[PDB]
Design a protein around this ligand. Structure first.
Ligand SMILES: Nc1ncnc2c1ncn2[C@@H]1O[C@H](COP(=O)(O)OP(=O)(O)O)[C@@H](O)[C@H]1O
Ligand SMILES: Nc1ncnc2c1ncn2[C@@H]1O[C@H](COP(=O)(O)OP(=O)(O)O)[C@@H](O)[C@H]1O
Ligand SMILES: Nc1ncnc2c1ncn2[C@@H]1O[C@H](COP(=O)(O)OP(=O)(O)O)[C@@H](O)[C@H]1O
Lengths: 281, 281, 281, 281, 281, 281, 281
C-alpha cells in the first residue's frame, strides 16, 4: 500500500536553524565542497562521502538540517519517514525502496532523507526485541539500494534517528552512512538563537527578553522552545481578535505561555544519548 | 470486508455539550481562526495544526466535541470507530485507510474523526501485549495518509482514546496529532451544565433541583449523567402511558431514577488518567 | 461453510413465559413505545436504543424473551446461535455477518437475536484464554455491522450470554447493546408461573399442586422445571399407551417425575452471576 | 477425502442384545411412541426428543442398541464413526457433515448414529488438550446441522462415546442430544443373557453351563464375553476339521477358551465411569 | 510424491519360517477357514475378522508370516512400508491411502500388509511426542478405508509394529485389526528351526551342529541368526573363489562367522515387549 | 532449484588410497564377487547386499574408497553431496531423489554415493535438534527409492558420514545400508602408505624419509597428510619459478612444509568415534 | 527482489595495500601460477584450489586483497555483499545464486568474491542462534554452485568474514574454500605501509612523520588509519577553501586529525580472533 514519493524544494534555510554552527559548516563541507569544488577533491585525491547519519534527542533540528542543506545546495529533497518504512515492513513490500531510489536518482541533485530510521527496530521490540539480529528486510533494501547507487550520481543520503542504539550497525560501514553526527540538546547560547530564528518572521515586542528565556530553559529542545513561541502567538491572536469583537507579540504573552512549558527530553534520556554519543563518536 | 464510509453533517452543537468551556474555546482557536482569519495567521506567520488527540475517561464528550466543532465550522464529519479499525486489522486490509482519506479529502471541509484509537493495541494484548512495539499496520497507514495529506486541503483530524498509555507515540510527533487535550471527568459545576444540556429539549418540572443532583454525583461521567435522565424519562413515559390506559418529567422520577445510578469510571482508573495526564501534559 | 439465514415468525408469546414481569414491561418500553408512539419519543426528544443484552444462568428464558418480544411487535425474528458464530470463526468467514445483517434489514421490522454470544470466547480458552484481548474477528464484525446499521431501519438486536465475564466490553458501549438486563433464576412465585406456563396447553389433573412443586425447587431454572413436566408427560403417555394394549397428567406422575429432578445451575455459578450482576448493573 | 455415506437396513434386533431391558424400553419410548402414537403426544402436548447420547465403557452394546432400535422401527441406519469424523477434522472438510445430514434426511425415517464422538477431542490432546475449549470445527458442524434439522423430518440422531468427560457440553443442551443414557458393564444376570444372545444361532452342547460362566466374569464387557464364545467356536471348528482329515460346541471348548479370557475394562476406568455417571445423571 | 503400489505373488512359504507353529495354525484359521469352509462359518454363524496386528521385536518374522500366509492362500500381497506412510505424512497426501485400498480391492484375494505402522508416531516424537493424541492423518485414513471396505471383498489387512506402545488404539477396535498377535524372540528349539529354514537351500556340511549354535544364541532374533549364516556363506564363497585363482559350507566357516555375532534386541527392550505383551494380551 | 546429476567414470584407483587393505578387500567381496561370480552366490544361496555406510572422521578416504571401488568394477559413479541434499531439504523438493535414482538406474552398473549423509540432521540442530525424530523428508525419500529399487538392477549405494550418531537408524535396517564400515584415522604404517600414494605421481627426492614423517604425525588424517605434501610442492614450485626469473621435491621443502602441519581431528572427536564405533560395530 | 550482478575491472592494485606481503605472495601462488604456468602444475601433478577464505577483523584489507588479486591477473571481479545474500535469504530466492555463478562463468577469467559471508548467520541469531545447524538456504546454494562449477572454468571464489566462528564448516571442506587465510590487524611496520599506501596519491607535507603516527596507533585497523588521513584531508581542504574566500596536507592537520582517532576493533574481539586463528590455522 506504499504512499506516493514526493520530490520538493526545501522551503527552509540556515537562518531558520538556531545554533549548530559547527554542523552547518561540516554539512557544507560534505555536500557543497565536492560539487562546487570538484577540482580541489581531485587535487588532493580523496573522494567524498555518500551520506550522513544524524542521531540525537527529538526536536533538535535533525530535519531542519537535512532540508536546509538541500536548499542551500539548491537541490531536491525527498523525505521518507517512519510510517512509510513501516508500511513496507508490515506489507512486505520493500521492493518499493528501489522506486524511492529511482525517483531520487531521476531528481538529482537530491538529498534523500530517511527520517525515523529506527522505527522498524522499535516495531519489532526495540531495546529487547524478537529472535534475530539487527537486519530487517526494508533497511536491508535501503543498504543495497545504496551499495548499487553509483557514487557519481548526485544523490546524497541522510538518515536520522533518536535511538541509534537500535539502528543496524551495517548502516555505518564505509560507503554508506559514514558520517555520524550528534545533534545534541540546545545549550545556553543556542536556545537564544533558536528563539530568534523561530521569531524571525514575527512582530516581537521590543521589551521581551529572550536571553532570559534562554536562561529559563534546559532539557528544552528546539521543538520545546518553538512550542513556547506558538503558545505566545496563539495568546496574542486570541488577545487580538478579542479586542475588536494592536498586534505585537509582547512580554505578558510569553510570560503566560511559559506557564505551560514542558521538556520533551528527560535527563535519563539525555544521559543515554551521551552514552550513545561516547562510543559512537 | 470494510464498512461503507459515511459523510454527514454533525447534528450536535456546543449547547448540547455541558461544560468544557476552555476546550471549546481552544478547539475554535484551532479550526475557526485558521479558516476564518487566514490573514492573521499569515500576518503572524505561524501555520495551523493538522489535528488533535483527545484522551480521557469514557463518556465525557470526546465525540460531542469532535462533532460540535465540525458543526460549528459548518463542515462535514467522518467517523471511523474501533471496530472499523479492527476490521482492517483482522482482514489485513489497511489499504482502505487510503480510501477513507480520499473520502475526507473529497468531502473537504471535513473533520475526520478516529475514535477508539487504541482498540488494535487492546486487541493485541494492550497493557502487556505481544512481541513487537507500538506500531501496527492500520494505525501506521493512518500516519502515512496523514503525512502525505497536504496541510492545505481542508481536512481536520481528530483522534480519541481512553487508553493513551497504549497509543503509538508516533501519533504525537509534529505534523500529526500535535495537540494533546485531556477531557477529564466533569466537575461539580460541569455536572449541572451537562444535566441542563441533556434536558434542553425536555419538559423538566420546575421544582426538580439539578444543582443538587450535581452535588450527588462524582466519578460520574457525562454518559453516567445522561443515563440518569433517560431512566427519569422512561419513568415519566411509563408513568404517562400508564394513566390513560399529564406529561412533565418531575421530582419523584429523578428520585426513583437515582436508585440505579452507576459510575462508569472507578477511582483507580481516574487516578491512572491523572498519571497519563501528568506526563502527557 | 455458513448455514442458511432463516427469518421466521416467533411462535411464542408472553403467556408461555413464567414470571419476569418487570423485564417484559421493560422490553416493551424498548421496542413497542418507539414504534407505536414515535410521537412521544419526538415530544420528549430522547431517541430509542439499538439493542439489548440479556445475561444470566442458562434455561431462564433469555430466548423466550427475545422471541416473545418479536412476536408481540408482530415482527420477524432471526436467530444466530453459537455454532453459527463458531463456523464463521473457524472458517474465517466473518464477512457473512454482513449477509445476516442484510437479511435482517430486508426483513424489517425484525429482531435479530445473537444467542450464545460468548461462544468464541470459550472456544479460544475463555476464563484463561489465548494471547490477545477480548476482540475476535467475528464479534467485531457484528459490531461494525451495527455501527453502520442506521438506527432508523427497523432492526432490533438482542444478545444473550451466560458468560458475561468473557463478552467483549465493546459490545456494551453506547450505540450498541446498551441495555444490560439480568435474567436471574426463577424465584418462589416465578416457579409457579413457569409451571403454569409450561402446562397451559396440557391436561393437568385438578389435585396436582404446583404451588408446592414451586416450594420444592430451587437452583431450578425454567429449563429444569420444564424437564420435570416433560418426564411427567412421558410418564402419562407411557402410562396411557400401556392400558390399551384415561388421559390426564396426574399427581403420581409428577411425583415419580420428581424422582429425577436435577438442578442445571450450581450455587457457585449462581454466586458468580451475582458478582457479574453487581458490577454489570 | 471423505468416505462414502452408506445407508443400510440394520441386520440386528433386540434378541441379539443381552440385558439392558430398561434402556430398550426407554429407547422405544423415545422413537416408537412419537411415530406410532403421534395422537398421544399431541394429546398430552409434549413434543419428542431429537436425539440421544449413549456413554459407557467399550463393548457394552452402544452400537447394538443404536442398530436394534433402527431395525425395530424398520428404519434406515447411517453410521458415522471415529475415523470418518477425524478425516473431516484433519482435512478441514466439515462441510461434508451437511452431506451426511442430507443423505439421512433423504433416507428418512433414519437413525443417524455418530459413534466415537470423542475422537477429535482425543486427537487434539484429550484429557489435557491444546489451547482452546471443547469446540471443534467438525462437531460444531454436527451441532448446526442439528439445529437447522427440522424436528419434523424423521431423522433420529444417536451419539456414542466412552469418554464423555471430553465431549463438548454443547452437545447436551436442549434440542440436541438431550437424553444421556449410561450403558454400564454387564452385571451378573446380564452376562448370562449376553452369552445366550451370542449363542442364539449356535449348536451349544446341552451340558455347557452359562449361568456359571456368568459367575466367572466381571470387568467383562459384552465384547469380552463374545470374545470367549468365538475362541470356543474357533476351537470346535479346528477340533472338527481336525477329525475328518461331530459338530456341537461343547464344555471343554469353553473351558479351554476361558484360558485366554481378558477384561477390556480395568477397575480404574470403571470407577471413572461412575464418576462421569454421577454428575452426568 | 507417493511411490507406485506393487501387487506381487509372495515368493515365501511356511518352510522358510522357523518355529511359530502356533501362530501359523492361528493365521490359517483366520484366512483359510473362512474362504475354504464358508459353509462351517455360516453353520456356526460367527463371521471372520478383517485383519491382524503382529507386534514384537524386530527380525522375528512378522513379514515372513504376512507373506507366507498370503502365498498359502495363493493370494496377492501388497506391502506398504514405513517410508511410504511417512511420504504421505510429510506430503500431506493421505488421500493416496484410498488408491492403495483400491489397488488391493481390485487385486482380491489379497493380503494388504502395513509394516512399520508406528513410523509416523516415531516421526512426531514417539515415546514423548508432540501436542496431540495418537491419531495422525495417515493412519486415520487407513482406518476409514478399512471401515468403508466391505467385509465381503477378499482383502485381508495385516499390520506389524515393533513399538505397539505408540500405535493408535483405534486400530485395535472391533472391525479393524482385532487380532493382536505377539511374535516373540525365538526360543531354544525355534532357533534350530530358524537355522534349518535359513539353510534349506544350502550345501550345509554334515558335521556342522546347529542344535548347538541354537544353544549359543539368545537375544538372538531370526534376523540375527540369518546374519550368522550369511557371514558363514560369505566366508565359504570367499574361501571358494580363493582356491581356484570344493563348495560345502562347513564347521570352521560357522565358527569364524560366530566371531561377529551380534544381538539386535537388548534385554531392556525384550523386557519392554513383555510389558506390552502383558496388558496387550 | 536442484543441481544437475553428473554420471562420470571414477578417475581414482586403489593405488591412490594409502592403507585400509582390509576394507578394500571387504569392498571387493561386496561388489565384485556378486557380479563376477554370480555362480558362487547362487551356489551357496546367499544374496548380496544393496549398499554400505562408511562412517569415520573426515579426510580418511571415505570418498576415495567409494570411487576406487566404482572404478575397479569399471562402473559409473554418481556423487550426491551435502549441499545437494540440503537444497532438496530447504526447497522441499525431495521428489528429485527419484530423478537421481533414475539417472543411476539408467547408468547401471553404477555406484550411487551419498556423501555427508548427516547434513540435514546437522542443519536441523543435530546433536540437540528440533521437535521430531530422526526422519526427514529427503533421507526418507532416499530410503523409499531404495526399497523400491530392485536388488537385481546394477546400482550399488554407498553412504558416508562423519556424524553417525545423528544418522537416521532406518538407513541401517536390512535391505538398505546394511554394511556399516568404520574408516578410522590412519595408523603408523598407513600414514607411510598414504604419503607414498599421495606422491606416486611426483618427483620425490631420494633422501626424503617418509617412514619418519609417518612417525611425526598422529591425529593426522589422510587429508592432513595430503595437506603437507601440497605445501611441500607449492614450496618446490615457488622455489623453482624463483631460480629462473632443478625440479625435484626435496628434504628442506618437506621440512619447511611441516612448520604448518595441523591436525583436522582432535582427540575428543576421535574418542567420540570409538564410542560410535563400539556400539555401531 | 535481487539486485543486478555487476562485473567490473578492479580499480585497485598491490600498491594500495599496506603490508601483508606474505599473503600477497601466497595469493599470487594460488591464482597466477596455475594460469601463467599451467606447465609447472602439470609437471608436478598437483591441481590448483577453487577458492580462499579470508577471515579477520574488519577494515584490514580483505576486500583490497580480493580486488588487487583480480586486477593483477587482469581479471573480472564480481562482488556479492552481505545485503545481497540477505535479500536472497529474506526473499527465499537463493535460486539467484545460480544466476550469479552464470554471470561469473560467462565473465571468466573472474574472481567471484562473497564478502560478509556470515551475515545470514548473524541475521538468524549468530553466536546463540535459532533451532538448526550452520546450514542455511543461501550459503548452501553457494556451495552447490561451487561443487557443480567445473574446476576448469576460470572462476576463482573468495569469501570474507569477520565472524568465522559462525560460518558453516562445509564451506571449508576440500573442493571449496580450502585456503583459510587470516588477515590480522596491521602491526608496527604495516601501519607505516598502510599510511604510505593511503597517501600515495596525495600532497603529503615533507615534515609529517608517519613512522611516528604508526607508533601512535594500535588496535588500529587499516580502516581506522584511513579514517585519520581523511580527517587530515578534510582539514586541509576546509583550511584551503577558507583562505581564498597553499595546498599541501601538513603536520598540524594530522595533529588535529589525531584528536578524533578511534579504534574499530577492541581487545576482546582481537583476542577472539586469535582463538579463531589458533584452531582454524
Ligand atoms: N421463564 C420461563 N418461562 C417458561 N419456560 C421457561 C422459562 N425459562 C425457561 N423455560 C424452559 O426452558 C427452555 C429454555 O429457555 P431459554 O429461554 O431457551 O433458555 P436461555 O435463557 O438459556 O435462552 C424454554 O424453552 C422453556 O421450556
Ligand atoms: N522366524 C523366522 N524364520 C526364519 N527366518 C527368519 C525368521 N525371523 C526372521 N528371519 C530372518 O530375518 C529376516 C527378517 O524377518 P522379518 O519377518 O522381515 O522381520 P520383522 O519381524 O521385523 O518383519 C527374514 O528375512 C529372515 O531372513
Ligand atoms: N586413505 C587415504 N589415502 C590417500 N589419500 C588420502 C586418504 N584419506 C585421505 N586422503 C587425502 O584426503 C582427501 C580427502 O579424502 P576423502 O575420502 O574425500 O575424505 P572423506 O574420508 O571425508 O570422504 C583425499 O582427496 C586425499 O587427498
Amino acid at each position: 500500500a506504499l504512499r506516493e514519493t514526493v520530490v520538493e524544494v526545501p522551503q527552509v534555510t540556515w537562518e531558520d536553524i538556531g545554533g549548530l554552527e559547527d554542523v552547518k559548516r561540516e554539512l557544507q563541507e560534505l555536500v557543497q565542497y565536492p560539487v562546487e569544488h570538484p577540482d580541489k577533491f581531485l587535487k588532493f585525491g580523496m573522494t567524498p562521502s555518500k551520506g550522513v547519519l544524524f542521531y540525537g534527542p527529538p526536536g533538535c533540528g535533525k530535519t531542519l538540517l537535512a532540508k536546509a542543506i538541500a536548499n542551500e545546495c539548491q537541490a531536491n529533497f525527498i523525505s521518507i519517514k517512519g510510517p512509510e518504512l513501516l508500511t513496507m515492513w508490515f506489507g512486505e513490500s520493500e521492493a518499493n525502496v528501489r522506486e524511492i531510489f529511482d525517483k531520487a536518482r531521476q531528481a538529482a541533485p537530491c538529498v534523500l532523507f530517511f527520517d525515523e530510521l529506527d522505527s522498524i527496530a522499535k516495531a519489532r521490540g526495540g531495546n529487547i526485541g524478537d529472535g534475530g539480529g539487527a537486519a530487517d528486510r526494508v533497511i536491508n533494501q535501503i543498504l543495497t539500494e545504496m551499495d548499487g547507487m553509483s557514487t557519481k550520481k548526485n544523490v546524497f543520503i541522510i538518515g536520522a534517528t533518536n535511538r541509534p542504539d537500535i539502528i543496524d550497525p551495517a548502516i555505518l560501514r564505509p560507503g554508506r552512512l559514514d558520517q555520524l553526527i550528534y545533534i545534541p540538546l540546545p545549550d545556553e547560547k543556542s536556545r537564544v538563537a533558536i528563539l530568534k530564528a523561530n521569531l524571525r518572521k514575527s512582530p516581537v515586542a521590543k521589551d521581551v527578553d529572550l536571553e532570559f528565556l534562554a536562561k529559563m530553559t534546559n532539557g528544552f529542545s528546539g521543538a520545546d522552545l518553538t512550542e513556547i513561541c506558538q503558545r505566545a502567538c496563539k495568546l496574542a491572536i486570541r488577545e487580538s481578535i478579542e479586542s475588536e469583537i494592536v498586534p505585537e507579540i509582547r512580554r505578558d504573552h510569553f510570560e503566560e505561555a511559559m506557564r505551560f512549558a514542558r521538556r520533551s527530553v528527560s535527563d535519563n534520556d539525555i544521559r543515554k544519548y551521551e552514552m550513545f554519543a561516547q562510543t559512537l563518536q
